[PDB]
Amino acid sequence: MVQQLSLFGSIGDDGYDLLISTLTTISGNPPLLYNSLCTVWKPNPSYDVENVNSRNQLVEPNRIKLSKEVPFSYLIDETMMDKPLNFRILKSFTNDKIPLNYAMTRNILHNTESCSPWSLQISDIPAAGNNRSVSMQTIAETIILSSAGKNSSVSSLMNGLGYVFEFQYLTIGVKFFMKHGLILELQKIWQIEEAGNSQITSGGFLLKAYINVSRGTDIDRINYTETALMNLKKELQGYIELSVPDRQSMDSRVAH
Amino acid sequence: GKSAVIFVERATPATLTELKDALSNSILSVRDPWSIDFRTYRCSIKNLPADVSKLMYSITFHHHGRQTVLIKDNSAMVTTAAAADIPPALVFNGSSTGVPESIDTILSSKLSNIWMQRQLIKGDAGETLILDGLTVRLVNLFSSTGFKGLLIELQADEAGEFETKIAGIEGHLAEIRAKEYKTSSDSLGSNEICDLAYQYVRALEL
Amino acid sequence: SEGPQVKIREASKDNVDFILSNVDLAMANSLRRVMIAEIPTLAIDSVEVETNTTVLADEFIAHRLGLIPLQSMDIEQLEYSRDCFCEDHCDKCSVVLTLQAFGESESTTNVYSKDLVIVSNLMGRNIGHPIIQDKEGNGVLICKLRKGQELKLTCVAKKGIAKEHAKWGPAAAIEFEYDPWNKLKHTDYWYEQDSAKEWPQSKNCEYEDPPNEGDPFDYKAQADTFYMNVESVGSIPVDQVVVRGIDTLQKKVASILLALTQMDQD
Amino acid sequence: MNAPDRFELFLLGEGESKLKIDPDTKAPNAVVITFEKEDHTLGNLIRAELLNDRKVLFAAYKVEHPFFARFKLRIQTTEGYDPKDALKNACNSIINKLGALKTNFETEWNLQTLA
Amino acid sequence: RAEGPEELARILQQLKLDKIIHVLTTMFENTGWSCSRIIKIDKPILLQRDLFIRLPHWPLNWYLILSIISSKTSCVVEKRIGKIVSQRGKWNLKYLDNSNVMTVKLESITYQKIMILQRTILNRIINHM
Amino acid sequence: TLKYICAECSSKLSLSRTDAVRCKDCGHRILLKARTKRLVQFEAR
Amino acid sequence: NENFEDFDVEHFSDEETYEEKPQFEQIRRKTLKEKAIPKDQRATTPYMTKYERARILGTRALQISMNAPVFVDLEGETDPLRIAMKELAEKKIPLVIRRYLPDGSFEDWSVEELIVDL
Amino acid sequence: YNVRMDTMANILYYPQKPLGTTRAMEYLKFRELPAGQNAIVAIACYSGYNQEDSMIMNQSSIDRGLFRSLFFRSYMDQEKKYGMSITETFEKPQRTNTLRMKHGTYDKLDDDGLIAPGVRVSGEDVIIGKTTPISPDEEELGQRTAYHSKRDASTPLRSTENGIVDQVLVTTNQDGLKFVKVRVRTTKIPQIGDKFASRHGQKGTIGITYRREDMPFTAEGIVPDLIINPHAIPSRMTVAHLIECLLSKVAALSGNEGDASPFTDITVEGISKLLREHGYQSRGFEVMYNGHTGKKLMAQIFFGPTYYQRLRHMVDDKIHARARGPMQVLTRQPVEGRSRDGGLRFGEMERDCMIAHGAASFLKERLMEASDAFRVHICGICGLMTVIAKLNHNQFECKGCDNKIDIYQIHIPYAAKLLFQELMAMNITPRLYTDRSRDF
Amino acid sequence: MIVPVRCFSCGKVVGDKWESYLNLLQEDELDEGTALSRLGLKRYCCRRMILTHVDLIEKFLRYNPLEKR
Ligand SMILES: [Mg+2]
Ligand SMILES: [Zn+2]
Ligand SMILES: [Zn+2]
Ligand SMILES: [Zn+2]
Ligand SMILES: [Zn+2]
Ligand SMILES: [Zn+2]
């Protein structure tokens, strides 16, 4: 049960390369290009559910999300084969134009036998205790290794759990594994739709500095990671503002 | 290779060692002990339509690197909880969170308003015996009310000559006065682990 | 054979009277307890009431219906409902009975256990039939109906043991006696003037030699030669009560062996 | 209201074993075995038939509270005799005695022709 | 991890007899004899060890009982013929041939004697009924 | 709308909200609500 | 309401019986520094009373339960009361007792110097 | 009783006429409407669970209907016309347009606001739905809108109670207003804590329940339904209990009813002769066997049927706990009664016992942190509680003294604050000061 | 109210013996002890179930049914 202590920030598109150089100097590690297609599934509205669970406690309906790494051949628009895969690729991705259209994601979901590995994540609202200076969130995570059968498609599999597809988004970014086990992502976010792709992070990069801790009861480890995150905010202080986002934004539960 | 599953529904609690001494001259070596718990989830939707089953079977092999398979309407879900067998791409891009949780814990914690656990069949402290180009894995299954039956898992490295091995094990089981076992070799469609879990599902159902 | 010895004195449809010799007191008492409590039996476990215009309460009727003895010859072939993959009950783990009685007569209409009708599929087993012992052919009197009153309900019979509820007990009263002459002195007889005449001799005193009144107390003698009369409720034959009790005790001891061997290899 | 269900007098709950064996530090070569979901029926049988073993120095059982269907069985054996093997031999002899009793009851019941 | 000199001497003698066991079982398994490691006997009749070797072409539940005896000086091997059965997870010598036993020296066993033993053992098993 | 039974006539009557609570056959002003049509489960212990 | 014939006695209710019969200095001043009896002339017992022991154990356990530093080595002990009793056993509780004499004067007895005889 | 909708009603399943009976109770119709059951009673110190008027009652006999009883509780409700538009209505309320709905369920109600007979109910479930209109355009509790034209006046079930709706009775009162009566039926199965008495003043509760295989048993296989203690007999000198058990044993064997009228010429010796004629020890003793081990008990046990009565004091109607709950409007102390989730009286002489123990802080915690902890401000000049405190603005002021810098807060019981304000109403000044003025 | 199915003490089924007990009483003119012994109730635990039973159900049956079909 991973607790995710994270901070968030934003930069413009013009300050991207300066931030890459700055975090290369701070980390000592070069940026690594990464991508992940995240498909978010909501519970079936046609199914009458109970507010209670198998236990006598009340449970709200929560969207759950699957993620996997799309190969970068699907994200190059037949102009960047000569350019090597590094942090300079994200300079080109400015508009809504992404080679990953809706039909290729439907081909990925419907698997048109055995499926690619996925990562199912369930996240609740971050804690409301106003004594923590970082956004602390709980993520229930599992890895779908493979699938088979006549309904091996992950869409029908997720329909098997009672979950329907709501939306999906593609994020491409660069990340730094820094010192003391801190991961610093710097990502664009595109929403994939039938009407066309939409760049959510329009003309800017979403910044996420997170540390994953396995045990939520290790208060020493929690405080150590929080001090590391506040330290990183202190070196980045003045240049870029890192702050705890609103908990209402990180609430993935279905409202009604 | 290929696998088949024999589940003697009604055998004595000491049939496992009785079957072991039946294969006294065929065992080459004994590997590490293994175990498995079998779970069954019933869908708790108050208004379910037709053409959909309410039963989902969760099969967690403690061997094959701590892997859980979910079966519903002949559809599989190979799911892991170990940190070792995560693909490096899933942990590199941050889609994974370093260490995962078992899908049984997710279903019994964050999905209990849809699926509740009904039956748990913990076949623990099993043994692995190696025949001539074969691997029999004997275990005693246990529901809530004590003994349930003897579960035999057949595994071969190859698959060219496999049904003769199944016939030999069936003849050995008939030699120890057990005639009403429910064998199963049905595959899906096709991984080995998912097919083994499906064979467990057909073996444990009647 | 060498071991415990059985000599049956009287055998009946619902009674067996036997002498259990060459056996310890713990084994005989454990057999008595297992027969009382640990033998699986079929009994009505859940009653779904559709119509009840009788003068009896619904759960009054349900408690009466649970206590109706049902045939349990093939109760091994049934499964526990908690061990079954069905949602509530099915033919693999339960027997579904029904009861539809109506007061169409001017006089009072008695509702008997013979009016219970099996509607589930028995698949050729020998369970679920209510046990009839009296000469009239009616069963246990379940309810009484005046004119116009109706009772429509559905029973689900599930297997259980008498530890869960006494309705699953097939053993009635089990007589049990050892040393009818008090030669082991396990009782110190209360008396006013003479314990020999104030205490009536049991019927099992005829099967043992009376003490000679001059011989010393035998301190080495242990308790054997148990006089047991088992009475069957009717769900299973009384010899099957004894045999299934021995089998259940054997299964418990084998389970102890199984647990010890599993944690021995780990 | 507070009455427990009647099935966990004999059903193992989640995450509990039928037996658990703890070494007893008061006496050498002695263990204490806790039998879950049993009562006096098995305890008296095992204890009184363990005492027939010549290599068992101590055998006693107790149900500490009638509310909970469990008992603790303390076995102390002579040196070189593991009390686990004493329990195995005791249970095996009880199995053999019950099997002989069952077969004798079949023979004597089949001798009855008035039933 | 040997504390006393007597402990190290016992460990050395155990290493000697285990080396003899290993070289014999590698000899026979490289030949093709399905040597068994799942079988233990309380006593097979100094510190000694026993090998229960078999080749799966002569009658079931029979094995060639190889018993080695080891000391600081002199170490020989006993070639016994016996029938071992498994009953309820326990191995019992249902038959043993203690009469026609020969004790060959360790420094004389070769692959040729293994060939001779393989050609002899099936006849020896047949003659034991 | 909802089924009611008079106290002594035992005749099933349907009453709406605007109707006065009386028996159309007896005029007896005590009426009993009808038993529920749904099946009710009784654990036979 | 209720109507029970099992007579339950109404406790704390003697007012019925009450209404049935209704007719028939030199050494120390103010709060100066003089109030403290000095250590050399303390006249109270050197033994720590059962009430002093109970309140020191309670106060120390309340502090230990509120993340106070612990001046003894823990042997896997978890309960704050048992940690407090272990601190009291080897005299590592940094508290004092102000024993008020009836005239308002007091003696300061440290927990370290008090003898735990009970 | 089925056509009587009484407020409370207890009906045994299986009334038994007594084996030992008086000639007088024929005219009392006691053999026609009995009030107890002939239970096979052993007088034995079996396991120590029947000490000090406890009893051990057979769990297997309980399973077969021994002392099982029906319990009926009727709930009354009416709709009353206070004025013209302020009238109550039996209907099923909805959360959209009704204020202060109870958090229990309303799904079991019908369109008339009444639950149908036969429906199982649990604790704090609404069985009668009633709504009264309210004044529109108010602002209460925050969750107030113009949609809420009514408020909930529904009748829930008792929180500890549950059962089956047995009969629902719609009718009109004398005034013509419709009023309903709902009868809920439940069964009280005997358990540890239910009070049982013989016909001789020998009351007691079930200490424990044993099953049949753990009970002591005679050579005939008879086990008691009830084990009572021998120590209940000699100090109370209840010889008639023993004579009843002997006479009931004889009556049950002979198939008659024992004449247990007081001043007849019926002796213990005649009953003992009759009991000996039936093949039993004449004084009622039976050689019984220990149920755990099968061994003969060294003492022989007085054994036989005795008429026992199930008393109305069940433990489940008396068990009560409260961690926090509603407070009274006046004293702001925990309310009285387990029906209203009340608190337990920590009386004056309980306080005296804690004083004698020397537990000052526990006494303070009982009187303050467990009942009523009130923070009130006083000024240093006058000891009165007449300080206007604005904690959001951090402003304090006592008018008259006109001081804003000499304010103290104290923690007193709310009953103490009420006492002081009542004393100010009687023109008495209970001035509270935080510093001494005179020496000790 | 109506005859219990099983004896409370031992569990012998006595609910089927009630009408035969009444028949042995009123048309065979037997006394109650011989009637109980004729039905096979030899333990007084079983004898007191039928002997002391008051059968109140027909008193309940004299009232008209509340719901008449
Ligand atoms: Mg008292
Ligand atoms: Zn089923
Ligand atoms: Zn009418
Ligand atoms: Zn003032
Ligand atoms: Zn104010
Ligand atoms: Zn009886």
SS3 letters across F1-45: CEEEEECCCCCEEEECCCCCCCCCCCCCCEEEECCCCCCEEEECC
Torsion of CA D87, D91, D92, D97, to 10 degrees: 140
Please judge whether H33 and I56 are an interchain contact, meaning their C-beta atoms are less than 8 angstroms apart: yes
Residues C148 and C119 in one domain: yes
Angle at C84 between CA C83 and CA C87, to 5 degrees: 125
Provide the pairing of β-strand B78-80 with B3-8: unpaired
Residue C175 · residue C228 · CB < 8 Å: yes
- Kindly provide the resolution of this structure in angstroms, with one decimal: 3.6
Residue B17 · residue E89 · CB < 8 Å: yes
DSSP string, H112-144: TSBBPTT-EE-TT-EEE-EEEE--SS---SS--
What is the layout of strands, in order, in the sheet containing C41-52? Answer: C117-118, C94-102, C150-160, C41-52, F40-43
Strand, helix or coil at E69?
strand
- What DSSP designation does H382 have? S
Identify the H or E element spanning H75.
Answer: strand H69-78
Distances from the Cα of E85 to the Cα of A76, E95, H218, angstroms: 69, 9, 51
Residue spans per domain, chain H:
1-14+69-189, 15-68+190-326, 327-428
The closest alpha carbon to E121, from E30, E58, E44, E50, belongs to: E58
| D17, D95, D106: residue with CB nearest C253 | D95
User: Which residues, listed in sequence order, are joined to residue B55 by a DSSP beta bridge?
Assistant: B42
Whose structure tokens read 């068990």? H319
Overall size of chain B counted in residues:
206
In angstroms, rounded to a whole number, what is the distance separating the alpha carbons of residues E27 and E6?
31
In angstroms, rounded to a whole number, what is the distance separating the alpha carbons of residues H13 and H9?
13
Fold assignment, H1-14+69-189: OB fold (Dihydrolipoamide Acetyltransferase, E2P) (2.40.50)
Question: Hey, how many other C-beta atoms are within 10 angstroms of the C-beta on H87?
Answer: 13
In angstroms, rounded to a whole number, what is the distance separating the alpha carbons of residues A221 and A177?
18
In angstroms, rounded to a whole number, what is the distance separating the alpha carbons of residues D55 and D85?
11
DSSP string, chain B: --EEEEEESS--TTHHHHHHHHTTTT--EEEEEEEEEEEEEEE--SS--SS--SEEEEEEESHHHHEEEEESSSB--EEE--SSSS-HHHHHTTSS-SS---HHHHHHHTSTTTEEEEEEEEEEEEEEEEETTEEEEEEEEE-SSSEEEEEEEEE-S--SS-HHHHHHHHHHHHHTT---EEEE-------HHHHHHHHHHHHH--
The closest alpha carbon to B131, from B20, B32, B34, belongs to: B20
Residue B114 · residue B43 · CB < 8 Å: yes
Overall size of chain E counted in residues:
129
Question: Hey, how many other C-beta atoms are within 10 angstroms of the C-beta on A97?
Answer: 12
Class of domain I1-66: mainly alpha
Residue H138 · residue H105 · CB < 8 Å: no
Measured between CB atoms, does D44 come within 8 Å of chain H?
yes
Rg (CA), chain G: 24
In angstroms, rounded to a whole number, what is the distance separating the alpha carbons of residues H196 and H45?
18
The closest alpha carbon to B22, from B109, B129, B147, B157, belongs to: B129
What is the separation, in whole angstroms, between the first and last Cα of chain C? 38
Least distant ligand from the CA of G7? 1
The closest alpha carbon to H77, from H163, H174, H154, H164, belongs to: H154
Rg (CA), chain C: 24
Identify the H or E element spanning D111.
Answer: helix D83-111
Probe site for chain H from D7, D40, D45, D71 (most H CB atoms < 10 A):
D40
- Residue H114: both structure tokens together: 């009444």
Residue H163 · residue H75 · CB < 8 Å: no
User: Which residues, listed in sequence order, are joined to residue B57 by a DSSP beta bridge?
Assistant: B40, B71
Residue spans per domain, chain F:
3-45
DSSP string, chain C: --S-EEEEEEE-SSEEEEEEES--HHHHHHHHHHHHHT--EEEEEEEEEEEE-SSS-HHHHHHHHHTS-EEETTTTTS--GGGSSSSS--TTTEEEEEEEEE--SSSPEEEEGGG-EE-S--TT-SEEEEP--STT----EEEEE-TT-EEEEEEEEEEE-TTT-GGG-----EEEE--TT-SS--S----SS-HHHHSPPPGGGGGSPPP-SSSPP-TT-----EEEEEE--SSS-HHHHHHHHHHHHHHHHHHHHHHHHHHH--
Residue H133 · residue H82 · CB < 8 Å: no
| In a domain? residue G43 | yes
- What DSSP designation does H369 have? I
Residue type, D83: P
Residues C175 and C254 in one domain: yes
Distances from the Cα of B105 to the Cα of A181, B41, B83, B86, I30, angstroms: 27, 12, 16, 18, 70
Q: Contacts by H358-362 with C-beta closer than 8 Å and gap 24+?
A: H358/G50, H358/G51, H358/G54, H359/G54, H361/G55, H361/G58
In angstroms, rounded to a whole number, what is the distance separating the alpha carbons of residues H50 and B193?
60
Instruction: Write phi, then psi, for I46 (nearest 5 degrees).
Output: -75, -30
- Residue H264: both structure tokens together: 């007849």
Angle at H371 between CA H368 and CA H377, to 5 degrees: 50
Q: Within a 13 Å sphere around the CA of A234, how many CA atoms are in the beta-carbon half?
A: 7
Angle at G113 between CA G110 and CA G116, to 5 degrees: 105
Question: Hey, how many other C-beta atoms are within 10 angstroms of the C-beta on D61?
Answer: 21
Please state which CATH number belongs to domain D1-115. 3.30.1360.10
Provide the CA D44 distance to its chain's centre, in angstroms.
Answer: 7
Handedness of CA H199, H200, H206, H209 (dihedral sign): negative
Handedness of CA H365, H371, H377, H380 (dihedral sign): negative
Residue type, H235: S
Residue I58 · residue C108 · CB < 8 Å: yes
In angstroms, rounded to a whole number, what is the distance separating the alpha carbons of residues C61 and C71?
20
User: Which residues, listed in sequence order, are joined to residue B3 by a DSSP beta bridge?
Assistant: B155
Class of domain H15-68+190-326: mainly beta
Split into its structural domains, chain G has a count of 1
Supply the range of the domain harboring residue C155: 41-166
Please judge whether I68 and F10 are an interchain contact, meaning their C-beta atoms are less than 8 angstroms apart: yes
- Residue E48: both structure tokens together: 């000694």
Residue C44 · residue C66 · CB < 8 Å: yes
Provide the pairing of β-strand A198-199 with A118-123: unpaired
In angstroms, rounded to a whole number, what is the distance separating the alpha carbons of residues D88 and C260?
8
With a CB cutoff of 8 Å and minimum separation 6, the contacts of H427 are: none
Given C166, C182, C204, the domain boundary residue is C166
- Residue B31: both structure tokens together: 């590997």
Residue C171 · residue C241 · CB < 8 Å: yes
In angstroms, rounded to a whole number, what is the distance separating the alpha carbons of residues H246 and H241?
9
Question: Hey, how many other C-beta atoms are within 10 angstroms of the C-beta on G59?
Answer: 15
Class of domain F3-45: mainly beta
In angstroms, rounded to a whole number, what is the distance separating the alpha carbons of residues B134 and G42?
90
CATH code for the domain of G87? 3.90.940.10
- What DSSP designation does E72 have? S
With a CB cutoff of 8 Å and minimum separation 6, the contacts of E110 are: none
In angstroms, rounded to a whole number, what is the distance separating the alpha carbons of residues A94 and A113?
36
Question: Hey, how many other C-beta atoms are within 10 angstroms of the C-beta on B195?
Answer: 23
In angstroms, rounded to a whole number, what is the distance separating the alpha carbons of residues H235 and C261?
56
Ligand 6 center to residue I10 CA distance, Å?
Answer: 4
- What DSSP designation does H297 have? P
- What DSSP designation does H46 have? -
Ligand 2 center to residue C85 CA distance, Å?
Answer: 6
Ligand 2 center to residue C83 CA distance, Å?
Answer: 8
Please judge whether C255 and B140 are an interchain contact, meaning their C-beta atoms are less than 8 angstroms apart: no
The closest alpha carbon to B76, from B205, B201, B184, belongs to: B201
Residue H2 · residue I63 · CB < 8 Å: yes
Torsion of CA H310, H311, H315, H320, to 10 degrees: 160
Provide the CA B60 distance to its chain's centre, in angstroms.
Answer: 7
In angstroms, rounded to a whole number, what is the distance separating the alpha carbons of residues E1 and H338?
71
Distances from the Cα of H424 to the Cα of D20, D86, H372, H418, H429, angstroms: 70, 83, 21, 10, 6
DSSP string, E36-57: BSS---S----EEEEEEE--TT
Chain breaks in chain E (C to N over 2.5 A) after: 45
Output the known binding site of C for Zn(2+): 84, 86, 90, 93
Q: Does domain H327-428 have CATH number 3.40.50.2300?
A: no
Measured between CB atoms, does I12 come within 8 Å of chain C?
yes
What determination technique applies here?
Answer: cryo-EM
With a CB cutoff of 8 Å and minimum separation 6, the contacts of C44 are: C65, C66, C68, C70, C97, C155, C156, C157, C167, F44
Q: Within a 13 Å sphere around the CA of B138, how many CA atoms are in the beta-carbon half?
A: 23
- Residue H101: both structure tokens together: 């709905």
Residues C105 and C172 in one domain: no
In E1-129 the beta strands, taken as DSSP E runs, fall at: 47-53, 62-70, 76-87, 90-105
Catalytic residues of H: 53
In angstroms, rounded to a whole number, what is the distance separating the alpha carbons of residues C34 and H367?
56
Residue H20 · residue H258 · CB < 8 Å: yes
Distances from the Cα of H99 to the Cα of A140, H115, H137, H144, H146, angstroms: 39, 21, 13, 8, 11
Measured between CB atoms, does B176 come within 8 Å of chain E?
no
Question: Hey, how many other C-beta atoms are within 10 angstroms of the C-beta on H14?
Answer: 23
Instruction: Write phi, then psi, for C29 (nearest 5 degrees).
Output: -70, -35
- What DSSP designation does H27 have? T
Given C122, C138, C166, the domain boundary residue is C166
Strand, helix or coil at A244?
coil
Split into its structural domains, chain C has a count of 2
In angstroms, rounded to a whole number, what is the distance separating the alpha carbons of residues H402 and B138?
90
Least distant ligand from the CA of H204? 1
In angstroms, rounded to a whole number, what is the distance separating the alpha carbons of residues H222 and H280?
13
The environment of the single-atom ion ligand 3, i.e. residues with CB closer than 5 A, is F 6, 9, 23, 25-26
Please judge whether I66 and F10 are an interchain contact, meaning their C-beta atoms are less than 8 angstroms apart: yes
Residue A222 · residue A240 · CB < 8 Å: no
- What DSSP designation does I58 have? H
